[PDB]
Symmetry: C2
Subunit: 123 residues, 2 copies
């Protein structure tokens, strides 16, 4: 049972997402924890922790649209450990630092990100 962390940036839904992610993870042999923070420094700490603990990461940067140099470095650190780092965006962008990206599938994008993590771990 591989531990995987789903981390969300700024901008209720967390409980709903936790339930869905726990269930999706269980079906994939993953133990999934979901967290959320408005503090980029905390997100950076969580990334460093993931690298230490060897836990794949699913990240929805949300309101962190501008990766600080620190967050970009932390993301590179996770990738450099050969850990999957899946980036999820719930909505599509309008015309008006990751292993792979999933955009526009609502919360189902997290399910696909977990599938991707399980696939990369089985290689």
């Amino acid at each position: 049972m591989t531990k995987v962390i789903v981390v969300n940036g700024p901008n209720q839904d967390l409980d709903t997402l936790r339930k869905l992610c726990a269930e999706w993870g269980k079906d994939l042999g993953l133990e999934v924890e979901v967290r959320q923070t408005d503090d980029e420094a905390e997100m950076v700490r969580w990334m460093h922790q993931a690298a230490d603990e060897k836990t794949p990461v699913v990240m929805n940067p949300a309101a962190f649209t501008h990766y600080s140099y620190a967050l970009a470095d932390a993301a590179h650190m996770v990738i450099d450990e050969n850990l999957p780092l899946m980036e999820v965006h719930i909505s599509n962008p309008s015309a008006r630092v990751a292993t792979g990206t999933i955009t526009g599938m609502g919360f189902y994008g997290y399910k696909l990100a977990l599938d991707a993590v399980a696939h990369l771990l089985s290689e």
Copy 2:
């Protein structure tokens, strides 16, 4: 089995054959009948998208080496999504006004990105 078409641009035989087999099998497991096509001509991709709109077929598109799009392609894409048909966009690797207004986009997962796109389509068909 719901028919789904996977359309690819130029410069993604062995690789396309592998992709085709994988899509066929992934589709089968999800109750989808999946056909995979490739073209170097954007006008042919437009014709395929028109056919998809006509036949009500979900589309998975990898524009591949097509870096810019014609208005005809953008229009064909709008017609597909306006019929509530998914137009999933897949990029093998990680990376506009004229755009295919994709329903959703998957990047960086190599061929596995297509499996994820198919899963997304099948999920919409679930009760």
